[PDB]
Amino acid sequence: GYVVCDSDKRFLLLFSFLKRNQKKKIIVFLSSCNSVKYYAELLNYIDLPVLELHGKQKQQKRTNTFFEFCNAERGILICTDVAARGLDIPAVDWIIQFDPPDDPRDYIHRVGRGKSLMFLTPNPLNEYEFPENKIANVQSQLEKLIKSNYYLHQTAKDGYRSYLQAYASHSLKTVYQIDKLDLAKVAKSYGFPV
């Protein structure tokens, strides 16, 4: 149904899932195609071998990687909302959209084709009670990791920005620029909101 998490504990909770669910086939959805260019660099760097799908990469790569996910057994990909339209795989158990969606109505059609949940503190199936203590302590490791690579500083820069630009180009009363930037920055690990 949904999980309630703050903008600090947002990617913290996501990273906590992907390590334990390495055996399974789960789907992570983002709003921007410039957000997945960050996550599919971090997780491949910290050795959770995820797959990368976005608009900014070439079509033959977009085909030959997504094909490999269909024929896999243990795999995991990161793809956007708009790029994953029409090509859905039954080989799935968790459909977990991370960002707020494009259409609040069309997402219902996206599910009933897998288990669905959202992430909302600023904003059928059951909610999920969440332990505060057992989140992974990889934040200061990431804070050291961001300010010492440049490439991951730039991809985080255009991860944070593109996410927040898509957050402002929404239509709902819930998703209308309420979330403070002192929390949203630590999702992409910053001392200042870029």
Binding site: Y45, N149, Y150, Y151
Partner: protein, 53 residues
Amino acid sequence: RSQSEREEEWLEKLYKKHGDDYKKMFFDKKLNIYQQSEGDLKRRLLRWKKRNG
């Protein structure tokens, strides 16, 4: 436009440890101390390879 002794020996280290995996080659903290791109590395290595065998 030739290359210096230190630059040549630096490219020796990169090729002997990695080969052609430019993603891994540029994400290495020990040899690629200056956090240079993939294009810079393949250009400089081909200059090194043309002057050698």
